[PDB]
Structure formats: C-alpha cells, structure tokens
Design a protein around this nucleic acid. Structure first.
Ligand SMILES: O=Cc1cccn1[C@@H]1O[C@H](COP(=O)(O)OP(=O)(O)OP(=O)(O)O)[C@@H](O)[C@H]1O
Ligand SMILES: [Mg+2]
Ligand SMILES: [Mg+2]
Length: 855
DNA sequence: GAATCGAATCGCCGC
RNA sequence: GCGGCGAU
DNA sequence: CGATTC
C-alpha cells in the first residue's frame, strides 16, 4: 500500500540543469555528477528507511503510530466521540433492558474508546477480516484500559507516579501488562483500590462490546464498510470487515510523501554550497527536503530570518563548511579489526531494603542490555560511513544552526560525534608541524589520555615520560592495548600515529590532526565574563592561575569545610511527627541533625565525584531540589548497592543535607552565574504573564515571547508553546485529541538558551577572526571545542581568547537584552522587575594571558 | 482563599 | 510522547 | 519553595 517516489522525483536531482551547472561552474562536471549521485543515494536510502519502518509497523499492528495515519485519525476522532456520546442518551431514553455492551462502554471515557477502536481495526485489517475477531480485539483492549486505568485515574493519582516511570521502562504490551498485574495485586494487599478485585469480562461480553464499537464507527465516519457473506445460510453466515479504499489511499499517499522528505544526509565529495539565504545551502541540488539555516519547529519561525542582515553569521557558517576532512585510515584499519572481536572495542580490557535494592540490580541489567545493543547500532553505522569515504581525497560537511545559533554539522557521520567518530576523522589540508605545532600536538595527546588537570609543562612531561609506550602503540596498535585504556582511546591512538611521524620525519612532517581546545565550563565562563566575576571567573579558568582550576573540587573543598564545622557545632537528632498522606497514619521517626549527617559524609569521603553532576547541571537550571535526586542517584545509592553506604542510615536525609551544602557552595563560588540566571528567569516570567485586571477580567497585556540578538548579529526568538489537550492510555500510547505560550517552559528555558546563544556567537566570531586575522582554513568545532591543524594551533589559541575579550568589552548583553523587552513590559509589573546585577572587579584583558581558559 | 505542580539544546536508534 | 544511545 | 491555578 505505498507509491514509489523514487522513479521520478529522485531522478530530477541528477537531471536538473541549474543545480548541475552551478556546481559544475565551481568544481567541474565529473565531481558534480558524483555529488548529485551521492545526494540522490541519500534520498533513496531515506525512502528505504521509511518503508522498512512502515512495513515493520504494518506487521506489528502499529500502523496508527505511523505519521502517515495521524492526519487521518485527527479528523475521524471528533466524529467518533460525538457518536460515542450520542448513543448513550438514546439507550438511556429508550425504555427496556439495556444492550449487553452498554454498561462496559461507560467504564472508559468517550475519548479513549474512540482511539482504541480505530487503532485496533487498523491493526487487524492491515496485519482475519471477520467482525467477530476484530470485535474481540477491541473488547480485550477496552477491558485492559478499563481494569488497569483504574489504577491511574482514581485510586493512585499520587501513587501512580511511583509506578508510572517503571511502567514506561517496560517495553512491550506483554511486559507492560504483566507489570500492571503486579502493581494491582500489591495495591489490593494494602486496600488501595477500594478493595475491589477486577471481575474479568467473559468472552461473550468481549465480542459484544466490539461489534457495538465497529457499528458506531461506520455511523460516524466512512473509514470502514460492512460486508456479509453467504447470507441466510446457517453454516456459512459471516460478516467480513473492510477498510475503505479511499482512506487507504490517503495513508498510502502520505506514506510516499513522507518517504521522500526524510533523507539520510551524507558527507559531500565537493565543498558544500555556501549559504546565501534562508534555505538551499549546504547540499547542492534542490531537494524534497531542503536544508534550513536555522532548525526551527515551525516554518513561521524560520521565515523570521528572511531579511535579517547578519553577514558575520553567514561568513562563519560558510568558512566552517569549507573545512576539508578525510578519514583517518590508520585509525580505521585498527577499528576494522577490534570491532570484529568486542561489541565495544575499549569496553572490558584485561588489566592488573533487600527486595527494593536488588530490584534495582535487576533493572540495571535490563537497562544495560538496552545500552549494549544501542551503542553497537551506532558503531556499525559510523564504521560503514567511514569505510565508504575512506579512499576519498577530501570530504566536507554542511553546517547549520539550532534556533539558539549553536553550529551543528548536517550529515549523520560528522566530527561532532563520539570518541571513535572523532578518531576516524582528520583534517585533509595539513602544514609542516614545526616546533610550536609539535608542542601543541603533545598537549593534545596528553588531553586524550586524561592528563588535563595539570599545568602544560606537566602534560609535556607525561608525554615525554611515556615516549616508549606511544611509539609502541603507533608501531603495533593491536599488540599494545595501552592506547585503548586512555580516556579518549581512538583520539589518543590518532595522536600516537602523528607523534610517531614527527619522530620518523622531524619538524618538517606534514601534520593535519585536529588539536581540540575545550573550554572549562562555557556557560559559567560566559556568565562570569558578563558580570565581571573575579571569583567565579577564576574558578572556570577565565583568569590566569597557578594550576588548572577545578570547579568540581572547589565546591567539594567548600563542602568539606562545612562538614567539619557541622561535625563540631551543629544540631542534634530529634524525633518528629511524620504522616504518610495516603494512608493517613501518624508516626514519629528520628530527624537526623547536622552533626550526625556531617559525620556520615565525612566517613564516606566527599570528593569532586559527589559534586560533579550538580555544578554541571547548574547552567541547565538545576538547584537545591534537583541536587538531592542527583546525590541520591549518583553517590548514595551506588554506595549502598556495593556494600558501602553503611553510614547512610536514612539516604534521603543524607541526600537532602548534601544538596543543601552543594547549593550553598555553588551559589557562593560562582555568584554571577546564579544572579544572571535569576534575572533572566524573572525577565521571562513577566513577559509570559497574561496580566489582567481581576475586576474587569480583560487581558491588558498579551503573553509575550522572549527575543534577543547575539553580538554576532544572530537573532533568536524563544516562544515555547503548549497544546491544549492530549490523551495518553496505559497499554496503547498517546495521541492528540491551537497553541499558547508555555509560560513554565519559558522560565525554565531562558537562562540555558541565552548562554548557549552566547557561546554560539563566540564560536562564530572565533571562526571568522581566526580566518581573517590569521590564515586558518581548517576548523574542528563542537560548540565550545575549537580545533585546527597543529601548525595553526597557537594562532587559534590566541584567536579564541581575543574574540571573548572583544565582545564583552563592547557589548553589555544583559543590558542589551533589557532594551528589547522593556517596551513590552506592562505598567503593573515594572516595579516588580529586578534591576541588572552589579558588575564585578574582573579585568577581561587577563583572559588573553590565561593558559587554561582554552576559550 | 487553598490544591496542585515543577523543580538546556541537538542528533541517531526503538516503540 | 515514551524507552535507550551519543554530542556540548 | 515559590508560582500557578482551582
Ligand atoms: O559535557 C557533558 C558530557 C557529555 C558526555 C560526557 N560528558 C561529561 O564531560 C566530562 C569530561 O569533562 P569534565 O566535565 O571536565 O570531567 P572531569 O572529570 O573533570 O575530567 P576527565 O577526567 O573526564 O578528563 C565527562 O566526565 C562527562 O561527565
Ligand atoms: Mg575531562
Ligand atoms: Mg557539557
């Protein structure tokens, strides 16, 4: 039931003359044919991908989950619900005893029966056409939502949350229902569902409820026609159900239309098409899916950039596209061997509360089995793409941006991937390495091993002390597994081959390995530079420092100062009344004081591992509440499951105490970060407010989106939007039944999105400034990682600091942010707008002399 | 007034 | 949307 | 612990 788009639509891509000539005028006809054939293959692979998924969803009875059937379902559902309703009054107004199926259909609300019927008849017809068997299919599906939705809807709307996540962790209808069977029995043992065990429907009841549902679908919609066979013959009287061909052609056309616009983007064998406008950049042919400069969730948001003059933004994207890459054949030769022997090549190298705790161990193996299969899937695809382009002289990647302006490569195989993917990709246009390039090659090799918390001379000494090990790895990587045991193994191996090249050829050796420089904590770095935070900036190495500054260990050091103070002074333990709000029981337990809680943590030993997740999620918006879950999940629970954690008698009390100390430490260490996110959150709060006079009720000021402009000239609009109603069932997944600004997501998004737009602007300005003031042509970019060939590494090191000093010396981005929305504020809320946070004593020009900023 | 909720972006794979 | 993986 | 909304 599908139409091959490929025969005509995909043929136009190679045939059309205006795309061919514009490509051939730059790189000739031979490369033009190769590039168009590659893009043609990408669309063909994408069509094949959709069709395999469509047929697998066809075979599994999940055809309503496919995107080609959703536009159908959304116009048939309101008619079904109106007819599902309208029956109920007719039988209630018709005297006499009710039909067999009337009472069952009241146990499930009209919306849920409308979807359950449509999905199950679509499943039964596509994947026996008798009305009896399709009636029982709905009948067993209605009863499942009736019996087990009882748990969700009424008795445990608070306690469902403690089984909702573990229900979602199960995959498969059988596993999900079996878990719900255990949940229902556990609840009844506590008298939670009213003590009423379900009386399962008889098979006679299940067929009769279905034929009521099929008949009501024919009345409301024309999706399905009824057909009788051998009418009047007692033995062979049957009714066969049929999907209406006019609606089958609707999903067929939509399946073909969607199959054309889902290509598998690949690297380019010619340089990518320079961006001159909103669309059509990157790849060279026109396409069923043309590339967009900004990845927006709506076509209206992309059209906002049409006449936006942002020349520096366009130059930055086009320069990055022009960077020539090639597959690292030496690394690829190694990876082609060890992936045949291990599922993950660097995974396991040989080297020298009982119910509720071991339930988590069982869930750990279940999660690990998912993780092992997931990691292997991506590994085999990356290796296939790397081998496909291995013998090419150079390959290129097109680039675009997310709606905040961060720069992303477009192809699935691209240098922004994991350690193996980065290890398989090297720059194509190298230069003689020289003395300076060799020095930075060793620094880059030291960072791949994980020796990055020590000053530069110690990184050099680590490489020079391990000179024998590095040369042994380059000469025979399969015979010496030392490279595989490092923090970034394949990138370390890539350094090993280049290091051996300098030994075999001297400083004239042409090297093209990308040497990445990663900023410490980019979000905190930008916030500290915004408000001139001396203490906060020094913690993220903005300032020149003795050693590499480690904000994870600084917070841990501050945490341990409170722990030892709380171990001498501090509160004692106390008994306090507690009450479970569900059961209503009033009990009394021990509330551990800070003196006891500090002693437990001092026994455990609080290091940077305890604090690392909390500050890492600070820029994402986490705070003292979120830290409690992080500490419980990352530190306390792994300790208890491994025989440690004997000090933690009440883990939630230890977690909440730890979250209080981390939040006190982080909010005192990086002050300007905390103040800046608070100010932006308050800004979005007043913008997303629908202010109104309560007496009149009239809307005085409409809720407003948040809009600002980066120093590079890239504009960004934040308008999180929410749907008005959505329905989710238990065994079968959710489905839609206009949009308004989601004010909650506006508050939760504004601070991370603002700082991410700033680091995108900084990256783009770095790429431009490095390309024009110096002569750098090759760029490796992952959002805050700046890499180039070793001979240009020192200049990139200088350029990335010069741009960051330049913007914040010239732009008050928070004050510029204020100048945008201040006209949109209402009279009643300007008094409640907090003032801009005060700037500090940090001198921005010290960033130029900072060794470990890297950015 | 309480009653409830809530506590970054992007891409791939699966349902 | 949910499950898992990866990138910052 | 605040905002948002019953
Ligand atoms: O971006 C987030 C991200 C995505 C994937 C992995 N990560 C984290 O990136 C860290 C490495 O950078 P750091 O933050 O400096 O950690 P570290 O312990 O101090 O240094 P290291 O020993 O790993 O070399 C890792 O640990 C991860 O949590
Ligand atoms: Mg690290
Ligand atoms: Mg990160």
């Amino acid at each position: 039931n599908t139409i091959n788009i490929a025969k005509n639509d995909f043929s136009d891509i190679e045939l059309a003359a205006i795309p061919f000539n514009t490509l051939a005028d730059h790189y000739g006809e031979r490369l033009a044919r190769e590039q168009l054939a590659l893009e043609h293959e990408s669309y063909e692979m994408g069509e094949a991908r959709f069709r395999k998924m469509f047929e697998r969803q066809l075979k599994a009875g999940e055809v309503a989950d496919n995107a080609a059937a959703k536009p159908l379902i959304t116009t048939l559902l309101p008619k079904m619900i109106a007819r599902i309703n309208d029956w109920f009054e007719e039988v209630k107004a018709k005297r006499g005893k009710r039909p067999t199926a009337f009472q069952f259909l009241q146990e499930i609300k009209p919306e849920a029966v409308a979807y359950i019927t449509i999905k199950t008849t679509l499943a039964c017809l596509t994947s026996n056409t008798t009305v009896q068997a399709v009636a029982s299919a709905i009948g067993r599906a209605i009863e499942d939502e009736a019996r087990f939705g009882r748990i969700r809807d009424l008795e445990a709307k608070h306690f469902k949350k403690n089984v909702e996540e573990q229900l979602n962790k199960r995959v498969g209808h059988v596993y999900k229902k079996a878990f719900m069977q255990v949940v229902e029995a556990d609840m009844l043992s506590k008298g939670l569902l009213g003590g009423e065990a379900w009386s399962s429907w008889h098979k006679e009841d299940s067929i009769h409820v279905g034929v009521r549902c099929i008949e009501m679908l024919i009345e409301s919609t024309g999706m399905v026609s009824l057909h009788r066979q051998n009418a009047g013959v007692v033995g062979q009287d049957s009714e066969t159900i049929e999907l209406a061909p006019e609606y089958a052609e609707a999903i067929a056309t939509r399946a073909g239309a969607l199959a054309g616009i889902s290509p598998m983007f690949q690297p380019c064998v010619v340089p990518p098409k320079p961006w001159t406008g909103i669309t059509g950049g990157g790849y060279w042919a026109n396409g069923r899916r043309p590339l967009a400069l900004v990845r927006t969730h709506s076509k209206k948001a992309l059209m906002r950039y049409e006449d936006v003059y942002m020349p520096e933004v366009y130059k930055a994207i086009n320069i990055a596209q022009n960077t020539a890459w090639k597959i690292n054949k030496k690394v690829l030769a190694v990876a082609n061997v060890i992936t045949k022997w291990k599922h993950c090549p660097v995974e396991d190298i040989p080297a020298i509360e009982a119910l509720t705790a071991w339930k988590r161990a069982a869930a750990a193996v279940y999660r690990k089995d998912k993780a092992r299969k997931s990691r292997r899937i991506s590994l085999e695809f990356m290796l296939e793409q790397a081998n496909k382009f291995a013998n090419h002289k150079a390959i290129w990647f097109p680039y675009n941006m997310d709606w905040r302006g961060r720069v992303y490569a477009v192809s699935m195989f691209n240098p922004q991937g994991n350690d193996m993917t980065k290890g398989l990709l090297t720059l194509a246009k190298g230069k003689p390495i020289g003395k300076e390039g060799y020095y930075w090659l060793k620094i880059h090799g030291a960072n791949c091993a994980g020796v990055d918390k020590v000053p530069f001379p110690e990184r050099i000494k680590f490489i020079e002390e391990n000179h024998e090990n590095i040369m042994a790895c380059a000469k025979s990587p399969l015979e010496n597994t030392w490279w595989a045991e490092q923090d970034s193994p394949f990138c370390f191996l890539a350094f090993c081959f280049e290091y051996a090249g300098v030994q075999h050829h001297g400083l004239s050796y042409n090297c093209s390995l990308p040497l990445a420089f990663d900023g410490s904590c980019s979000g905190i770095q930008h916030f500290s530079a915004m408000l001139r935070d001396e203490v906060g900036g020094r913690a993220v190495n903005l300032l020149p420092s003795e050693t590499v500054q480690d904000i994870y260990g600084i917070v841990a050091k501050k945490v341990n100062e409170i722990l030892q103070a709380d171990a001498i002074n501090g509160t004692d333990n106390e008994v306090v009344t507690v009450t479970d709000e569900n059961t209503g029981e009033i009990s009394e337990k021990v509330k551990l004081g800070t003196k006891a809680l500090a002693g437990q943590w001092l026994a455990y030993g609080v290091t940077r591992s305890v604090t690392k997740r909390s500050v890492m999620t600070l820029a994402y918006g986490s705070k003292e509440f979120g830290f409690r879950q992080q500490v419980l999940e990352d530190t306390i629970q792994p300790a208890i499951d491994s025989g440690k954690g004997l000090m933690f008698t009440q883990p939630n009390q230890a977690a909440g105490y730890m979250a209080k100390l981390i939040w006190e430490s982080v909010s005192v260490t990086v002050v300007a970060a905390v103040e800046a996110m608070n100010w932006l959150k308050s800004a979005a709060k007043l913008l997303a407010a629908e202010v109104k006079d309560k007496k009149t009720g009239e809307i005085l000021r409409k809720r407003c989106a948040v809009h600002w402009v980066t120093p590079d000239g890239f504009p960004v609009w934040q308008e999180y939007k929410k749907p008005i109603q959505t329905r989710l069932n238990l065994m079968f997944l959710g489905q839609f039944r206009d949009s308004e600004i989601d004010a909650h997501k506006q508050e939760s998004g504004i601070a991370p999105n603002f700082v991410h737009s700033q680091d995108g602007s900084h990256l783009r300005k770095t790429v431009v400034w490095a390309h024009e003031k110096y002569g750098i042509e090759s760029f490796a970019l992952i959002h805050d990682s700046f890499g180039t060939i070793p001979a240009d590494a020192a200049n990139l090191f200088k350029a990335v600091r010069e741009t960051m000093v330049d913007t914040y010396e010239s732009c008050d981005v928070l004050a510029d942010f204020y100048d945008q929305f201040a006209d949109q504020l209402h009279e009643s809320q300007l008094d409640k707008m907090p003032a801009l946070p005060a700037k500090g004593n940090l001198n921005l020009r010290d960033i130029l002399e900072s060794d470990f900023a890297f950015a």
